[PDB]
Design a binder for this molecule. Sequence first.
Ligand SMILES: Cc1cc2nc3c(=O)[nH]c(=O)nc-3n(C[C@H](O)[C@H](O)[C@H](O)COP(=O)(O)O)c2cc1C
Ligand SMILES: Cc1cc2nc3c(=O)[nH]c(=O)nc-3n(C[C@H](O)[C@H](O)[C@H](O)COP(=O)(O)O)c2cc1C
Ligand SMILES: Nc1ncnc2c1ncn2[C@@H]1O[C@H](COP(=O)(O)OP(=O)(O)O)[C@@H](O)[C@H]1O
Ligand SMILES: Nc1ncnc2c1ncn2[C@@H]1O[C@H](COP(=O)(O)OP(=O)(O)O)[C@@H](O)[C@H]1O
Ligand SMILES: Nc1ncnc2c1ncn2[C@@H]1O[C@H](COP(=O)(O)O)[C@@H](O)[C@H]1O
Ligand SMILES: Nc1ncnc2c1ncn2[C@@H]1O[C@H](COP(=O)(O)O)[C@@H](O)[C@H]1O
Lengths: 268, 270
Amino acid sequence: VVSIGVFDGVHIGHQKVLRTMKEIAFFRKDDSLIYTISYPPEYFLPDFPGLLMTVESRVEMLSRYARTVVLDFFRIKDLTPEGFVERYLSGVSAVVVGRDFRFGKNASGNASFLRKKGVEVYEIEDVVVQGKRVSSSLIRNLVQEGRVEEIPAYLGRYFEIEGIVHKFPTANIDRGNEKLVDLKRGVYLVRVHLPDGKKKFGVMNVGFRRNVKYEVYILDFEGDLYGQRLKLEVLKFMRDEKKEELKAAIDQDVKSARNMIDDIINSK
Amino acid sequence: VVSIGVFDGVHIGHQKVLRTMKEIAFFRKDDSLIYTISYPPEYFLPDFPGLLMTVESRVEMLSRYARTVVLDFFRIKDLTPEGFVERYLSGVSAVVVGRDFRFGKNASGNASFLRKKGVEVYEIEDVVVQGKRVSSSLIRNLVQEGRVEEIPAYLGRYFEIEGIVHFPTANIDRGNEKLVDLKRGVYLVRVHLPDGKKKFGVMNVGFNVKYEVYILDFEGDLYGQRLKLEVLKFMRDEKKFDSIEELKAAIDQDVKSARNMIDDIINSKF
Ligand SMILES: Cc1cc2nc3c(=O)[nH]c(=O)nc-3n(C[C@H](O)[C@H](O)[C@H](O)COP(=O)(O)O)c2cc1C
Ligand SMILES: Cc1cc2nc3c(=O)[nH]c(=O)nc-3n(C[C@H](O)[C@H](O)[C@H](O)COP(=O)(O)O)c2cc1C
Ligand SMILES: Nc1ncnc2c1ncn2[C@@H]1O[C@H](COP(=O)(O)OP(=O)(O)O)[C@@H](O)[C@H]1O
Ligand SMILES: Nc1ncnc2c1ncn2[C@@H]1O[C@H](COP(=O)(O)OP(=O)(O)O)[C@@H](O)[C@H]1O
Ligand SMILES: Nc1ncnc2c1ncn2[C@@H]1O[C@H](COP(=O)(O)O)[C@@H](O)[C@H]1O
Ligand SMILES: Nc1ncnc2c1ncn2[C@@H]1O[C@H](COP(=O)(O)O)[C@@H](O)[C@H]1O
């Protein structure tokens, strides 16, 4: 029994499907297999916002659920429905998908098809947080419009920026090379997970050059992060990206951060 | 600094103007301000093709460049050049526009006037594309011939139909403004759904004019939500079908080419 799809971000509508995968599992005595497609057709277009995380990262969550097998978009973009079943669904007798799920050169095959190929399709009806069908798209935008405080209602958690370092002080994050989405330009209140389990707060600014840069000033930290990797949770969108008195502006933020922080701490 | 004119479509011409503004201003630690004249004289004359987008849409885009302010046409329409200057340009150093920029009753207002009155007018050379001065007027003719493929070249992006929604086909209410109509026929389009998803779809214009799109791989009520539709390719002439089925056939023959062209649009990135 397997659920197919991209699963980018692995949102709440995603987790729905995965769990139902566990159900149809037990009551079938079968084992579970997630089939995560590398990229959506869109990815290969200019106006594509971006992925919410790297595939490597996505197969970290998808994994913590079932056994994930990544399907390469190049390798399957021309396979026909029949071609697909044969090369990827043999032996399997049931899939878990959503009301939309299509597949095969020209979306040639719906669930009906798979049914007529001797396979059971358990369609999970759409999940919707506040009037809209959760989706990577929908989250892909709030990220663009700086609406971070609005993401947990869809992502099941805070949006995250993560990468290798270098390449005030501020740490420069290299989110890798995949075509990832970028946040509205600006200053953000962030939660930093450092090595050794450390979770320090910080402020992160995002600016141009075309390109977008990610720099965080981690509060109360004074060590070397040059080579290290980091995972930052974007909690709040503080202020917009501005204009030699900048060293004076950041303090608005820092002194501000310290305050938003202490806000929670008190509200036991 | 300040820029003036209608700005219907905000095409590459319009952009060179707004970008020059955005610069002439940094060179001065000055501030931008766009004055968009709601309409153009033709708008109220026999046979006006209509605008490309609603004034609201238009302000929307201009907004990303700088503070925008709309001026009723009917108002400044009568003002004399000094009048106009006395009401809007006061204490404003620079004014970015391009050749052929005029203002005031009977167009007596021009760049020389602003200059003689202490304001620095920075004309911009007309932007040519394939031996043509980019113009809101041009683009309109294209839309009208269904030559939507040639549009991005001048317009700087894909022509776009929009409105409120009022196999199944969504009925777009473009609005009550006077907008330009496409050649009646069938088009491949790219839909921008309320939620945020972008599905391909196929639109048909026929006949005022009626616009209805059948979005590919999609199901859900949209009655009441807005849709922006990038018009990507012209496929066929909206013809008469004396038998319902001949239509069902055609419509399906349309959705077929749709699907393939789409495969083309992607197998063309590697
Ligand atoms: C909390 C924080 C807030 C910042 N806010 C801004 C800002 O609003 N505008 C800006 O231009 N730079 C800001 N910066 C700094 C730039 O990111 C900094 O100049 C960096 O070196 C990269 O910018 P650069 O490529 O222009 O040199 C901020 C830095 C920090 C740590
Ligand atoms: C892709 C697509 C192509 C269409 N092509 C035509 C066409 O060539 N001729 C036609 O009369 N109707 C066509 N239709 C249907 C009309 O748009 C339909 O009659 C609709 O109800 C509006 O037309 P009406 O106002 O005359 O009823 C097409 C519909 C779709 C979705
Ligand atoms: N509190 C801190 N926040 C961000 N980086 C720090 C901090 N403390 C030490 N560093 C280190 O210093 C580097 C930033 O160096 P520097 O060149 O001085 O500034 P910039 O951020 O402009 O590149 C980081 O790569 C990191 O290893
Ligand atoms: N894939 C789709 N394409 C077009 N409309 C759809 C689709 N799915 C659902 N709809 C909805 O169906 C309605 C259009 O219904 P229909 O009566 O069949 O078309 P029309 O009256 O324009 O010929 C709209 O409210 C629209 O939001
Ligand atoms: N919001 C949602 N509600 C229900 N099912 C969903 C939702 N979002 C995704 N799915 C299903 O989960 C799988 C997700 O893959 P993808 O759409 O590529 O992210 C597909 O089989 C979808 O139908
Ligand atoms: N193709 C072009 N190249 C350079 N400037 C242009 C072009 N088309 C229009 N402009 C300028 O941009 C402004 C556009 O206003 P309007 O002509 O009303 O749309 C006027 O001040 C024109 O001089």
